């Protein structure tokens, strides 16, 4: 039942319900063997379930001689822990515990982008390279974010402009922590989830749809103490969810697909660099997509019920489909995207511009990003 | 010019006058891109850069786009060598206009400390950029720029924070030897030695041969126009070459074959624990001299190490100005008597039994490994 998913060679990515409390610490004294294992995380994940793993790890540290242990670091939360001077409070750390932390140590990245974006580039640097294994707690973390060995930090000139690529020794997928996934950022991951299946299998995209109303149903239900949030559609919402980090996966292992996970991120990135960080990356490349693929429809690449049906899918699940969605308005207390700043942020990425554009839904134009004329992309922004 | 290969493709281009007239030319033509950045400190940069921004725009002008030359000037010493100076590095290529992309050809002009903390700063810069290595010392030629090695310093040690990175291309000018402080030379000699006395028997002979002439060399004052080197220019190349191809040799060794990755470290088990006590007023070279006669002494102790090999050792080190002894005046004087106890010896050693490269025979390692020997056979041989 622990479904494995590999990616360039072998499989990293575990995924199912309860990793965290019954597999992970076993599984990482008996297939990532040390010494020392250095947990990471901010202190809000980490006063919640942080303690519940402090005691799964001594009973099966302990059937061990010497036991292995357990360091812990907690960041303060917020994507500011993400910075040159934290990445250093937890290197200073380390090599500061007696013993000092040494090359045999596994770096455990409990969270979400940020969390795994640093630690993942801690560890990279780390004495030149240590191990480390991923273990999102987002939605966004677990199809997109950890998977791809793409870890940095930001600086006050620009996102992800220092990092590495370390690819995580393992990357524990535990759905449960779904089950407490703030209900926006639960629909903010599901952008990227709906991405994946819209360019590669019209199939997935179909059974997203139909799932839709039953998982945005689960996601907002009041989950009585004892009962599990997704009761009853656990195996829909397993299937739905490792579909997207499966692609991502099989994207990774292989530049003509690699492009294609920019599907909606041309102009996502260009709304997202204005609204940010009032709304989410998810939310950006819900309306990025939309207008993405009305520009298909305007080379008349792409047929308008494939236009429709992007967009009703996307709201289906709570996303929003166009800056004059009201919840951004507020959110924004409006702040208007031109399109000449639109246009402006897509070249700070010249007289062209390369979108991913689609001919069906589940089948790209090219195997490859497309070159489009300015004019007709500033046609689809407003 | 003489081309080595390192991890199937060669980037080790070694010659005189590379810096001159070729690395500007080569860059262009095998590093196609239009940003190019120079790092190095403020003395080895007043002297050599100079010249390089003229070789530049030459060979760049024929090129259209014309690509562009930035270029950074960091405080001489390890001190440039921190978590900060790759910080203002970074900032200041994030901060030039237009930024530098991830097209950028990172030049790392300087020594151990400018090729560690360059090749870092690279090796993250957008989570990775193409760099390329122009060492300008002996030991930075034959050692340091060769192995994809980089990292910074901390409060708390050594290279602690850093990543393994290979450089594109590696040009050893062997001119820059001409100039390189007397001490410094002897300094890289140290590693020379060292590898030769780890492959081959026959390699050793040479440099004990050429020792009396090349030292005579280095030490001789040149006269103006005229080449330091006159007369010895093969005999040089081939010396040195000789090192840093076989170090060239042992990165290329794929596989989990750190048994001639750990024949690399002979004389330092015992040269780190020195080095550790004598820094900064001594060299990693003059301790690592000091490292090697030990070791070697210990291999005799062993019965492993014939007398005569372990004598030879000795002799040569010394023929090429290299110290032997922790006794040894100049030693003596620069760490102002300062002792090194055979228990702060056994400490830093422990702080890395204990695992040391044996020699059987001058040219002949005792295992293809570093072999296991016990503290009080090492400890007979630090008193
Ligand atoms: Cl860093
Ligand atoms: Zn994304
Ligand atoms: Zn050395």
Redesign the pocket.
């Given at each position: 039942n622990p479904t494995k998913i590999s990616i360039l060679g072998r499989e990293s990515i575990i995924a199912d319900f309860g990793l965290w409390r019954n597999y992970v610490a076993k599984d990482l004294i008996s297939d990532c063997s040390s010494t020392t294992y250095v947990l990471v995380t901010d202190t809000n994940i980490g006063s919640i379930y942080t303690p519940s793993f402090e005691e799964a790890f001594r009973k099966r540290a302990a059937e061990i001689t010497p036991s292995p242990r357990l360091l812990i670091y907690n960041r303060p939360p917020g994507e500011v822990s993400k910075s040159?001077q934290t990445?250093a409070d937890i290197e200073d750390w380390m090599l500061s515990q007696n013993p000092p932390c040494g090359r045999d140590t596994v770096v455990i990245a409990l969270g979400g982008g940020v969390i795994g974006d640093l630690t993942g580039?801690v560890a990279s640097?780390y004495m030149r390279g240590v191990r480390y294994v991923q273990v999102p707690t987002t939605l966004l973390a677990m199809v997109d974010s950890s998977i791809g060995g793409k870890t940095a930090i930001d600086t006050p000139l620009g996102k992800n402009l220092?990092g590495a690529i370390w690819q995580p020794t393992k990357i524990y997928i535990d759905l449960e922590f779904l089950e407490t996934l703030p209900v926006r950022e639960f629909i903010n991951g599901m952008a990227e989830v709906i991405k994946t299946a819209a360019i590669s299998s019209e199939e997935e995209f179909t059974a997203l749809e139909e799932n839709a109303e039953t998982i945005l149903k689960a996601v907002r239900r009041e989950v009585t103490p004892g009962e599990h949030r997704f009761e009853g559609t656990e195996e829909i919402l397993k299937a739905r969810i490792l579909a997207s980090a499966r692609h991502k996966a099989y994207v990774v292992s292989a530049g003509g697909l690699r492009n294609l996970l920019n599907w909606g991120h041309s102009i996502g990135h260009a709304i997202e660099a204005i609204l940010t960080p009032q709304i989410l990356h998810g939310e950006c490349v819900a309306i990025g997509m939309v207008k993405e693929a009305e520009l298909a429809r305007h080379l008349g690449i792409l047929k308008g019920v494939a236009v429709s049906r992007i967009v009703k899918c996307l709201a289906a699940y709570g996303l929003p489909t166009s800056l004059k969605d009201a919840r951004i308005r507020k959110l924004t207390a409006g702040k208007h995207c031109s399109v000449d700043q639109l246009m402006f942020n897509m070249a700070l990425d010249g007289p062209k511009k390369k979108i991913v554009l689609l001919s069906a839904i589940g089948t790209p134009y090219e195997t490859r990003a497309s070159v489009v004329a300015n004019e007709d992309i500033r046609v689809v922004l407003a």
């Open positions: 040159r990445k580039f640097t220092i």
